[PDB]
Nanobody, 124 residues
Framework: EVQLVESGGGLVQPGRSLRLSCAASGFDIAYYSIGWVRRAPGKGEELVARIYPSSSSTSYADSVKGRFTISADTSKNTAYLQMNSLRAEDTAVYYC??????????????????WGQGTLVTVS
């Protein structure tokens, strides 16, 4: 009954922008931490961005700060990753993730409990 359904990926040129969407079902997004993880061949895997329900503050990986913005629309029960100034090294499969309540405001990758299906973003 808990579902995270992603959309918004694609293939674009360097310098352009994309907005990933993560439509949540089965819980109220205003009370849960949402984040984005990415993976790619020959790379590792990395936490990109996270939003915390305590103060709606955000945190970002060093390589994307100032270019990516994570946010949530409580009215639509959806989180977004706004990806501006895309770079070749941003090519990856991106996943939306939810954290368990027990770790909602605890920073790090520990505590995730649901994930989206994966969305490919490619910079040409």
């Amino acid at each position: 009954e808990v579902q995270l359904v992603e959309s918004g990926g694609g293939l674009v040129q360097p310098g352009r922008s994309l907005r990933l969407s993560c439509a949540a079902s089965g819980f109220d997004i205003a009370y849960y931490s949402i984040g984005w993880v990415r993976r790619a061949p020959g790379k590792g895997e990395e936490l990109v961005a996270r939003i915390y329900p305590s103060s709606s503050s955000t945190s970002y990986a060093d390589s994307v700060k100032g270019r990516f913005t994570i946010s949530a629309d409580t009215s639509k029960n959806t989180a977004y990753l706004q990806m501006n100034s895309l770079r070749a090294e941003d090519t990856a499969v991106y996943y939306c993730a939810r954290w368990h309540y027990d770790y909602a405001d605890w920073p790090g990758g520990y505590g995730m409990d649901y994930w989206g299906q994966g969305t490919l973003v490619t910079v040409s």
